[PDB]
Amino acid sequence: RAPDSVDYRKKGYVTPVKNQGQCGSCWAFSSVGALEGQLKKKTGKLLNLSPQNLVDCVSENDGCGGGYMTNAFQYVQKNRGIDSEDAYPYVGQEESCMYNPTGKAAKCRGYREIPEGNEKALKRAVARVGPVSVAIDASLTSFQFYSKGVYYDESCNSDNLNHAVLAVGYGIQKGNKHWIIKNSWGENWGNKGYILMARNKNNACGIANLASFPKM
């Protein structure tokens, strides 16, 4: 049995909240977040990796038109590296691939998927591994206006995954189980860029339907 609560922000595994701007690059922020957690876990260094590297270079993804985190991990594995943010700065528009091996800050040895719909497996993976990339339905205005508490909306559609975020922990707020979710909509959004999402409420918003983490 894993701990009852985990918060990777307390352990220094999570970088500041980013703003994707007018680009469908959520998948690239999700992906770098999970790679950043494994880098801190294995090396002791917390550094910003390059979402822009993924947007421009993951040819199996659609740049600002969307993508999957598994494709991004497979690219970093095949490419033998991903740049730091400092070597490959975020623009928020899709450009030609300008990967530079000199600015390489992490590698990837592949990835694992959480069994679809399994919040028990997702909990165990967050505890054992660290921050996990997840996909959700973030389409509801209830989600967009989030301020506090543990987000739950029965209209959330688990078969309508449209947003990629990062599970950096889980807990219980006054008896309500939750996932601690880092968003990429800037510090201004939600609770300083974070949302607590309902946990063990029948896979609310499809939180455990498309979860993955990189090997390092």
Q: Which residue has the tokens 């508490």?
A: 149
Please tell me which residue in 183, 203, 205, 209 is annotated as part of the active site.
183
User: Dihedral of CA 18/77/71/166: which sign?
Assistant: negative
Q: What is the DSSP letter of 52?
A: H
What is the Cα–Cα distance from 124 to 121, expressed in whole angstroms?
A: 5
Please tell me which residue in 163, 178, 203, 205 is annotated as part of the active site.
163
Catalytic annotation on 163? Answer: yes
CB 64 within 8 A of CB 57: no
User: Dihedral of CA 41/42/48/50: which sign?
Assistant: negative
Taking Cα atoms as reference points, which of 184, 205, 188 lies closest to residue 25?
Answer: 184
User: What are the tokens at 95?
Assistant: 């450009």
Catalytic annotation on 61? Answer: no
Please tell me which residue in 26, 57, 108, 205 is annotated as part of the active site.
26
Catalytic annotation on 108? Answer: no
Catalytic residues: 26, 163, 183
